[PDB]
Amino acid sequence: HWGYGKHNGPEHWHKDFPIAKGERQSPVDIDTHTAKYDPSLKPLSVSYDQATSLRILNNGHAFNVEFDDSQDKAVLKGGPLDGTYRLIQFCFHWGSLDGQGSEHTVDKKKYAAELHLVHWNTKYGDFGKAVQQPDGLAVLGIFLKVGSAKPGLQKVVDVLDSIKTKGKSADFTNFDPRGLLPESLDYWTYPGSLTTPPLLECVTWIVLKEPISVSSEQVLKFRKLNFNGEGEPEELMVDNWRPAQPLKNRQIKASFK
Ligand SMILES: NS(=O)(=O)c1ccccc1
Ligand SMILES: NS(=O)(=O)c1ccccc1
Ligand SMILES: [Zn+2]
């Protein structure tokens, strides 16, 4: 099954998930000189004061922190979105080296990592119905660069010991995802897809211009995770990112001049 290695990596995905070669795939390179400012964009609204994290999971491809999404406790709205999108999980992608790791790129620049706060459109009732819709998900993408430590990430970094291998999960309650946001909400937006199989084209992407800084030590601990299960041969979870895909017939809009 799919992964990131030479034999089951992003160039193989299309054989089991033909939409890999589709019309609105993610990630993409964000050409900052081609992105247009869009005055029709309403202000973005991230309302996470009531977020309830539950658990953290190594799924063999990344780790995810999952949230209770049985009510309107953590929601994204505004910007390009119509309606209310509920936070369900965040996932991270990172590199083997500080010069690579992000899925999206900005004028071909790769960041050390990328965070996705994944939200589903409450008009579709559940996450699994939402992914079957062209406007079913809204994902907030945040770049990580290596520099100063991010205090608000350390609780994540510290629990990774307990979820080293594929299929391990741990309790992860009372984690405040607001601690992972940069100061500015200036963003670029375009229509795209999940960046892992099944690669469904159900995402409004909202990619923040301002990266967060994390320390070398923080990102180093990401790189100690394993893709393999417990008692299998150790394969470090690194370079779990898909490269940029053709833009095709899409425009990236900017929220800012
Ligand atoms: N990556 S994929 O098309 O799902 C795949 C499945 C099995 C073996 C190799 C690759
Ligand atoms: N990594 S992503 O596009 O945000 C994604 C979100 C949910 C399921 C699978 C992938
Ligand atoms: Zn992701």
UniProtKB/Swiss-Prot annotation:
Site description Involved in the binding of some activators, including histamine and L-histidine, residues in chain: Q89
Effect ascribed to mutating E114Q: Strongly reduced activity and sulfonamide affinity
Entry cofactors: Zn(2+); Co(2+)
Consequence when changing V139H: Impaired activity
Gene3D superfamilies on file: Alpha carbonic anhydrase
Effect upon mutating P198A: Normal CO(2) hydrase activity, but impaired stability
Modified residues (Phosphoserine): S162, S169
Catalysed reactions listed for this entry: hydrogencarbonate + H(+) = CO2 + H2O; urea = cyanamide + H2O
Site entry: Fine-tunes the proton-transfer properties of H-64: Y4, N59, N64
Binding residues for Zn(2+): C91, H93, H116
Annotated Gene Ontology cellular component terms: apical part of cell; cytoplasm; cytosol; extracellular exosome; myelin sheath; plasma membrane
EC number: 4.2.1.1, 4.2.1.69
UniProt-recorded name of the protein: Carbonic anhydrase 2
Species whose genome carries this gene: Homo sapiens
